[PDB]
Amino acid sequence: GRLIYTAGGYFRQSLSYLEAYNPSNGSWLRLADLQVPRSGLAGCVVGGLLYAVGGRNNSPDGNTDSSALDCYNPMTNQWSPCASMSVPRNRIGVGVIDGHIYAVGGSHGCIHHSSVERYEPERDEWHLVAPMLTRRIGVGVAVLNRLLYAVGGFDGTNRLNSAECYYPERNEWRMITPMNTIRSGAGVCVLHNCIYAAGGYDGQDQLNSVERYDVETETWTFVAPMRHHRSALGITVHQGKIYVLGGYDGHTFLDSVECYDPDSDTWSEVTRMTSGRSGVGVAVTMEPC
């Protein structure tokens, strides 16, 4: 559509915020709160509807991993509950193929999932598919040419540079070339023929580096680093540019929003979120009402 939506996230506790940024004019709009606060969720769009998937409610009265799927209709400014997933999935990644939502990995307490499940909006149903070859939480997910990619993350013991690809018609996962950088909670998205992985955490440091995988060459190449080191960032594509939103730099929960121009290989500061936060869900759709 035309707006970048940011849902949930974390600052001091899990957040219920839904806010929409308009790159055309720089404005932010605050919209209807999520029914349940959540950080470590993912956002996606199917048929112009915005979905918030998984996460965890870290609140002063308990911590609860979410198996929730909720649907935001920009036409009504209302959130509606959908069928819940088979399992809670905190620090989840998601991808959309052919109008179906894949929920990938994430944690439930000390359980780090390799499992994957697929949502069909037409029947409001989840179904498990083949699990990944690797347990991954803080996993980056993107879709390119109707193939689903799971990139980096944390397996319970180590942060990962590994990545793998799901071939739907074979219901099968296969490893791809690993990234040059260990990244957990990177922002992962697609632009042109490349899967980009921006920032993340390696067990020691939050990262500013950005690399991209060309499916034709099966190789990863670094591009210009972001202006800010950041893990648990939100990422999306809007008009052929990558936008990264918030995250954590080892010091501050960032309000910084940066944009990448692939043609000039440059990052620029574009706006600030209304407040600093990390672990948001982000996606793009039409403006409300």
Which residues bind to ligand 0PL, rule: CB under 6 A?
10, 39-40, 58, 91, 138, 154, 159, 184-185, 201, 206, 231-232, 248, 278-279
| Binder of residue 23, out of ligand 0PL, Cl ion, none (CB less than 5 to 8 A by kind) | none
Residue with Cβ nearer ligand 0PL (21 or 201)? 201
d(CA 128, CA 142): 18
Residue with Cβ nearer ligand 0PL (23 or 279)? 279
Residue with Cβ nearer ligand 0PL (211 or 288)? 211
In whole angstroms, the minimum distance from the beta carbon of 190 to ligand 0PL comes to 19
Structure tokens at 166: 């799901």
Question: DSSP labels for the chain?
Answer: --EEEEE--EESEE---EEEEETTTTEEEE-PPPSS--BS-EEEEETTEEEEE--EEEETTEEEE---EEEEETTTTEEEE-PPPSS--BS-EEEEETTEEEEE--EETTEE---EEEEETTTTEEEEEPPPSS--BS-EEEEETTEEEEEEEE-SS-EEEEEEEEEGGGTEEEEEPPPSS--BS-EEEEETTEEEEE--B-SS-B---EEEEETTTTEEEEEPPPSS--BS-EEEEETTEEEEE--B-SS-B--EEEEEETTTTEEEEEEE-SS--BS-EEEEEPPP-
In whole angstroms, the minimum distance from the beta carbon of 232 to Cl ion comes to 9
Residue with Cβ nearer Cl ion (27 or 59)? 59
| Binder of residue 234, out of Cl ion, ligand 0PL, none (CB less than 5 to 8 A by kind) | none
d(CA 152, CA 192): 21
Residue with Cβ nearer ligand 0PL (247 or 288)? 247
Residue with Cβ nearer ligand 0PL (171 or 204)? 204
* Per-residue contact string for residues 29-48; x = within reach of Cl ion by CB under 5 A: -----------x--------
In whole angstroms, the minimum distance from the beta carbon of 268 to ligand 0PL comes to 24
| Binder of residue 194, out of Cl ion, ligand 0PL, none (CB less than 5 to 8 A by kind) | none
Residue with Cβ nearer ligand 0PL (115 or 278)? 278
In whole angstroms, the minimum distance from the beta carbon of 91 to Cl ion comes to 6
| Binder of residue 115, out of ligand 0PL, Cl ion, none (CB less than 5 to 8 A by kind) | none
Tell me how many residues contact Cl ion (CB under 5 A).
1
In whole angstroms, the minimum distance from the beta carbon of 174 to ligand 0PL comes to 24
In whole angstroms, the minimum distance from the beta carbon of 267 to Cl ion comes to 27
Are 41 and 281 in contact by the 8 Å Cβ rule? The answer is: yes
Are 100 and 84 in contact by the 8 Å Cβ rule? The answer is: no
| Binder of residue 105, out of ligand 0PL, Cl ion, none (CB less than 5 to 8 A by kind) | none
